[model samples]
Target: RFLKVKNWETDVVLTDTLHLKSTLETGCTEHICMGSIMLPTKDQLFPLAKEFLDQYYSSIKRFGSKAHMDRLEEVNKEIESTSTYQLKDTELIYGAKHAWRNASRCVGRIQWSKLQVFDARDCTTAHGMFNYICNHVKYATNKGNLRSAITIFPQRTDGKHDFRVWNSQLIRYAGYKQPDGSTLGDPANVQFTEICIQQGWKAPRGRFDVLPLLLQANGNDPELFQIPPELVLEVPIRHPKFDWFKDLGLKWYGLPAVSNMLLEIGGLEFSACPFSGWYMGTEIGVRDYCDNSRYNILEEVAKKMDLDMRKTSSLWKDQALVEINIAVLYSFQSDKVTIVDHHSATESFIKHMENEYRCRGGCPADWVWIVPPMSGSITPVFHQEMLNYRLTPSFEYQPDPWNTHVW
Candidate 1:
């Protein structure tokens, strides 16, 4: 039922995670001052994805090689190190000392321990309360106990496994980082330092130190500390450890592990007919047997039913499967693009604008006469994927033909 925290009040600590997508807004008040929130980081998404990708790719990589089956344990071992979606900068990460009183059940569902792992014996999903085994980084209190409750789904059938790996490393290259330093769906990597060293930006600021300098600088906006006229040429960069003063190009600043995984996965041959089209989930009123929780009913259901088995089990089996159609509308004249994702796109926009902002940050103030590299006049419209599934780029995934979805 409920996580029993030692010595802490035994009640649910109310939090806004139920509305996380909205609650995690930018520049919200953190304590007494205004602070910018970092978007999700790689640390959040990688391990979950790594599990599927590991299975997907390892299977593919071993299709002809001598790779052993024992590698599954390695995957589990790697995953245990992942933390709950909580980031490091919060006043007390994972809530203020025993603070999950009212954490959204949905958000809490993201615990790494609850993750379903595939069976090493039959290549099937596991079943068992293995949560006690999760790799926790710290045991905050005397009552702290290791817990893991992973279970294997019984039933085995053949179906295409579409493990979508979005390349968290690549996501970083594309500009993504939560205020707490976790990704929306991936995990952060230690190699991030390599990128910081390569790019000559601020030496990967400490997790707590990355707060927007402008927000806390000299008790006011950082931009206000400007020197007049002739002094502009003499300003030295802060942080002596950073080498950006050398004026080297930023080509090497990209995250390599993410790049490596992307390249590795990209090389695999994969395709998704994926029900041939989109099927609406709860967001749409078309009630179907396929509950959001059961839509993922594992691979074994095929022995008994053809389409999604969970959908067949719904009481409203006769209801038509809601088809989700998407279209991109762009106001080229005004430079605005909108996708028909019926759900809220605030997080998506924050992600996109952050990218735009970071890119803009790189521009030199002196280059006012030059056109900004990403400042095209048209506002690019992004289409949302209502179906919460990951995509594996087809081996034929040609970049020239991919418009906006790649990022």
Candidate 2:
């Protein structure tokens, strides 16, 4: 009771086997279980793409390939002519409308290419690569005139997929509708959640282990996002909002239960993990040690892009905004927090005019833990006034500190 154990060697010889995490053997397979809406991974995206091509061939044959080709040509022409990719804050979105319309034709083709598509992990990386390439071309050349912002999303982190890069650096909207049929917010109303497995980020080991950890550092953790949860593409059963989150007897397995409920209602799939550390921690040493820095470099490059990458001229207007928003959000995901001292920067970034922002009473990037609203219900807006108190309360190095406000 007098002394605890740690990886740090106390003397000439080390005793306790405890050490920081490194092996994929320990954390890779284990995950936080939740009824999450799963998306097509890089692997699964290819088959989906092929299936769409098949469907396109069939549909074209029925309607005549000439007509389909003509339509594709017209759309391609429009994409080539358009410009502008910036979200004017209220101009609504940052990417090109034409790009979206074009991508929709090939959407879900990766899954379509394979067998029934039971699990997303079965696909290959090339699928995500091709999908992103075509979509990026459309987005860069057509919508946001910053054709060079391609660097923002590094296509291949590893060597296998070089030309093929990160799929639209933007969060792909699922275009969800409520049971009553009201369309959710704009397509741009999305959040960023980065998972660095190869890096030192540790996945959760125990059942619902992440819930309490998330709840403790609710407002402080940079990885937490407040995106429109219902729009995850896969429908989730309504999750009830708390009466106002208060630290109490921490229940470890609550998230798994909630996930089960979601599966029962709408069949969602998501992964959760124990977080031993944030890739970007509040501490200065760990900031930007992960994907955060990459996001910034891409933004800087996009801002000064001078080449005339547009196929069409109409979409050029939104190009800069697209670049800016992409940079801003990606930068937000970095392990470092940028202090907003300038009045203009604070004013512009502080309040979002979008319905999603207003609905949550703040930006999704502003919070640490986002409890998704139950089906047909939106959770209470998070109050920043609760920042260090109601949400994130500092604590010493203790395993279970939920009920303790002591730092």
Candidate 3:
């Protein structure tokens, strides 16, 4: 099925899978893949040691006090070794949960305790990375009832090279530049798209093409893996009342599984960590579809809605923006996909903050990210104060993979 509006029409394929990846060349040269590259001296590892011991002591108290000293000696040995400190299963699980809770930008930290942690640290090949990421996509996508999860690969060790997932997300849209110079899809992945083409993967001509997985293990050449169509879940976008809006042929993936962000636990950095949570509608409705640099569909949407486009005071943009968001909500719900409206999401954030205060003493949040884009002031989070701090065992935005090399 397809719908047409003025100059655009999209094929509304009801598919079980949707692929997403970016192609933009990040001209950044800093080594952000592993957070700050200023190597931590042995002294800095002290915090990590103490953290592990604290968790270790607490974890074993329920089992038996007799095993405490033995585990402590082992932990101390692992920390003293020139290699990376090893985490027990409980420790790993705790680290992943705390990482999400401490992540400054995530509003869905309330679901942190439910995250399914996958330890792929022993994975050593691009092929292995591909397999693990495909599984991450398959599981996280969860047939449109998206599940929050993270697969943590090997950390950057003292003498070992970093293992990195090159793409910004395990799933993301590709941006193709047209002859007219305006981008046909997402402009963000254009550079990575070029890299994929150069690396011999077949490139799509459409603007909303799903970029394949690009995996690099230990600084070797990146490898491309096409996600299985059945593993992806995509929602076809349409408005509830506006029949003509269907012609725009818009769709988006069910989950926003970010892959480029580094997962930091204590002092260790998991460069290849990819995690996902269900979407807060504004991320798609406002930023992805309405951002001037992204789909930039507000003008097209405004025209379709027949709203006055002449003056800024007309508020045509705001009116159209709300309708677009409504369309996103309506479409996702129609398809039975898991999604949260900005209003509900902000409520969840507020609850998460309250829970954090009672449990962790404080919640780290980036107000700019926590506040919904479309309706800023009305949301409770809009008026609240937030503490944005660098907390250990957190998820962080690393420099883009391409940024590691100077242009």
Candidate 4:
């Protein structure tokens, strides 16, 4: 339809373009189409490429090498051409480091540049995955002194089958639902544990049983492998002040390596990217131990602390929370395991933001994840304004690899 007005100099066509714009703005407001709409737009690719180019250039310049400049140019050319290209070992390592730096959910990006990148793109079998994962665990665990590391599998490419690590982490606890109403271990892993049992793997009966690595390649049914207990260092939680806290028998692995996340770099997705940083005390103490669906130990800790459990106004939960956090910090420190307290972690995150701002003009941070679960308002991040945007060459939460039917 043609629309003409006296006040207008020219006639306007009220065509599909006009109605399409309106539909885009408000038509799908109630639907889940917002996030599921599309993958990264073609416009986003340029920024992603530029980010990688800068990092690659800096790494080359650091070594005072002019030879790699041509390699950088070639890589950028491939990016612009929309063609898949292989990354050099140096480039892969540097890109992995940058991905951590650009991660919004991680508060420990202060150590981003120091991540050890393990190049395992050649590993395509479940057997190879187990070996590489074991090596990763051994290196990252470093006995008690934890070192941050990431092992990257093959990136998804056309005509090539992709690899994925199905486990949430290289190390996690198996959750067994007892005949009683209670669960034995981490309830979060119950589904994966059951899947392992169905696959003919032996299930542990204990409450604190360590789960094995579940690996799959080309979207095949997952294969399970047990991790050496010595390679997987665990800290037995105990409070410096309370001797009775040891009886709770709470413990957690030294390294928190997330395995199921997809690493997106320059429009390519690596679904099996496994990365780890040392523990933040509150992650274990506040969430894993306190969440209702998790261990749900607040009431237990409160009862042990002899606090008034009847009223919410008594602040018994708060007192117990602090004690639990203190115990986590004390235990990790006593064992000489690398761990950061929430207060120190918050300060480090603030410094990371400042560092990123000066270097990159802006820092992307998720305020909810950035703020510690406990005493959030007291932390500097709570007062700071955070901007979170989807940036490429970043890690993203992907669908559980076990449920995905395709590679």
Candidate 5:
């Protein structure tokens, strides 16, 4: 055990050293972990860029190799002439892979190295950005046989010329605020849906209307574009035993591409890189359908199952939850789409944890997000104490462009 902590008076010793120190202060005290903070921003790019290139060379060491030194000198000369330097295509792909591996919230680290990195750093207009995203969705979705991928647009050059995707995710169902004070679809995206409507998108008021993309290029005003209807994939939810589950008409998308997160490698910042991976079943069944704030279908699901909705002692909520998750797995499997149930997902993550510790001394995990929403005590992760710390190359949260006033 290369870890240690002690209660000197009580003679209590603890060992978990890789995470013994927080990589950042994080507005959290020793007693509580603030795992959801934004990554620290930077003031100087050249020094930070220098640090990352050095780390990259070391990763590919024989230190002082001719190739490494030549590239190092090339980058310095490029930066000396112009205030910035461009990453080699190989380095760009390498950084994206590392970001996925370092993502603390994702349990799919086992497949991190299998990513397809698409470079759109040459894209300049909102329409051009839309075309790249469309291609990304089609390629990644692969007729419901999903593949993990990331498409990175131009890096943030000056503070004024950053390229950005305005949608929170590459694809999302529109949430319309109704006249009677209720959301018609995914409540989580009401704000973005409104922004799309304001941008002249004609809404059909349907429950699952895909919201148009809002992309900003070269610090221009965001432009909206409809995701071509044929490019999206959906698996209608159904249960093997309960035929009525299909009748409920619930469905979820195939891709889970996060669009707004900033990708950082060394000192370079990519503000408009969209990343995707296949979903864990619990994300759809437990949080999307059952969570009170989202679809909130628990009451309907419980009623259809003939469970006593008024009685908590009957454990109807618990029973319905399991059935709903079972339906999610069955639906995706039957549709030949990629998905993993929480039990198997967590089990694989345990293996990832062990491997990461052996290879890198520690793995950063947010205990709150890592544990499954239901049956947490039974999962392997429930008993494992994990640490949360910042590491790069990493995907980070950036303030929403609509809300930010200035640099």
Candidate 6:
């Protein structure tokens, strides 16, 4: 390397991660920096099955015991003969929590130990998948008292027979592309919303319309299922100080359930393991609400506050950003939804880092992602140096089904 790198403003020190990315077969992989999308093939799960099996027994202090050695041998024979092996429900549950704990980008791992893991491996159809999902949404939502949880589907037995959720997040608003090339809802979901419509969804064309779940089972064409409206808890964003803020008519789903992330435990990939956690304030306020690609509400919010839009020095954006975050924090509280503000979340994440180091030598953290988007300078994570490396059992990104499946 030519030189060492460090940011003077925030004191962010950078270390080399090229080798790490290569090892993980992510980012720069097989020839290119292919972003986060990985083209996962049928990996020989036998070798790493032992790695995971050992860790599983070792964690409970049962390594070299009769049960542990037998399990180790049992997995080896099964994988060698059948080309696959099944995990006990206990192993799946432990792997689920471990994946959450090893999530590098998650700042909420302080609550990882409390996650409610559900096994939905028996589901065979889209409707079957939906039933489990509804229950998950119901339990996790819990009438606005959100909880961290994950529901794991059957593990991938072959490349051709993946069980996957098509939606990026389980609960998200649809975006209807208008005639004038404008969008009515969350623009982030415009493409996926079109896919839903193509799959026979009668477009309601509403700004906050919830999209249906698209579940693909075993190389089959995905089936759409409507989520029970009662189970999908939504909080209306409003300003405590301004009564007019409600007129904007902004609402967000309480569950930030990510469905598309693939969970890999000991080389065995659970392609349809949907997981959820409550929202942090700025995810809605700063990024989703104010980002240009999203709702782009900064200009509107500035106008509402009568902040000067004419000059850069007006700091209208900062004022609007602050108010928007306040509205998000205030609204979620008013609705009695479980949410954490950025400051408190950052504080706990630091405590989690310490705990992880004591339990393991290092905690995988992407400083860029771990740091809060709003008021980054004030958050302690902004100044800290973090080295992100892959650890498994881990939740990893997989290529979209549309890319792999022939229409």
TM-score of each: 0.15, 0.18, 0.86, 0.83, 0.91, 0.91
Q: At residue 55, what lDDT does model 6 achieve?
A: 79
Candidate 6 ranges with C-alpha deviation above 4 Å:
1-43
Q: How well is each residue in 1-407 modelled by candidate 2, as lDDT tens digits? A: 11121212222211211112111111122364222322113333333323333334443353446754554444344334532011121111111111111121111111211211011122233333234333433433322121221211221222222221111222222222346764332222111112222212253332111211121121121122222322211111110222211121111100101100000000111111010111111111111111242212222332345424444464332353333333332333331322111222222322321221233221112122221111101222122211111110001111222122232
Q: What local lDDT does model 5 show for residue 336? A: 93
The CA lDDT at 327 in model 4 is 94
Q: Which regions of candidate 3 deviate over 4 angstroms?
A: 1-40, 59-69, 158-160, 405-407
For model 4, which pairs clash? none
Residue lDDT tens for model 6, 336-370: 99899999998898777766655665567777788
lDDT of 6: 0.84
Badly placed stretches (over 4 Å) of model 1 are 1-68, 74-374, 379-407
Deviation in Å, model 6, residue 10 alpha carbon: 14
Between candidates 4 and 6, the one scoring higher on TM-score is 6
The CA lDDT at 4 in model 5 is: 42
CA lDDT, candidate 6, residue 122: 90
lDDT of each: 0.21, 0.22, 0.76, 0.76, 0.83, 0.84
lDDT of 4 by residue, 138-214 (tens): 98888878899999888876513657776888888889888898888999988988877877778867778888777
| Whole-model lDDT, model 1 | 0.21
Error of 1 at 96 (Å): 33
- Runs in model 2 deviating more than 4 A are 1-128, 141-345, 353-407
Query: How many Å off is the CA of 318 in candidate 4?
Result: 0.6
Query: Which window of 10 residues has the lowest lDDT sum in candidate 1?
Result: 271-280
